[PDB]
Amino acid sequence: GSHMNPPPPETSNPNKPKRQTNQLQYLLRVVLKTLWKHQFAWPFQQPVDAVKLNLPDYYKIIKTPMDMGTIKKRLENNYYWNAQECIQDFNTMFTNCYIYNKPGDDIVLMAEALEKLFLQKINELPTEE
Numbered sequence: 869g870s871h872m873n874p875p876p877p878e879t880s881n882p883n884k885p886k887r888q889t890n891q892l893q894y895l896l897r898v899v900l901k902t903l904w905k906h907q908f909a910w911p912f913q914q915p916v917d918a919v920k921l922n923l924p925d926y927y928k929i930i931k932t933p934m935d936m937g938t939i940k941k942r943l944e945n946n947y948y949w950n951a952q953e954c955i956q957d958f959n960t961m962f963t964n965c966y967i968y969n970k971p972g973d974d975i976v977l978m979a980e981a982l983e984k985l986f987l988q989k990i991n992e993l994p995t996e997e
């Protein structure tokens with residue numbers, strides 16, 4: 869935990885109201901589970917360690933960091949009120965990658981593959997009930 873990396877996004881706050889929904893259950897059991905085991909998930913399984921990767925400008929450019937390790941903990945620890953909050957975290961993670969990296973780059977192709985899978989699964993997100 870280098871002082872030069874920011875604290876990770878919040879995964880626990882007892883003041884924030886929490887709810888289990890069937891959609892959130894789907895996001896954990898189907899969407900996260902599927903993306904987590906993809907061959908290209910590893911760069912997205914934890915916050916970007918800008919120290920280790922020698923990217924001192926990362927947290928200069930990316931002011932809303934997000935990663936699937938954070939999303940996994942948010943889903944496992946019922947941090948969310950609704951599915952939109954969680955979908956937004958996934959979208960933020962993909963867009964961070966697209967903003968920071970060049971269109972050709974391996975990391976972008978890897979994010980695009982996870983995003984295509986994500987969209988397939990979110991198209992089947994169940995009606996809330």
Ligand SMILES: CC(=O)N[C@@H](Cc1ccc(O)cc1)C(=O)NCC#CBr
Nearest residue numbers: 911912916921923965968969974975
């Ligand atoms: C989520 C994300 O952006 N990924 C990291 C780490 C990473 C990059 C490429 C790769 O093949 C495996 C890991 C990163 O390097 N970010 C910007 C830059 C640069 Br150089």
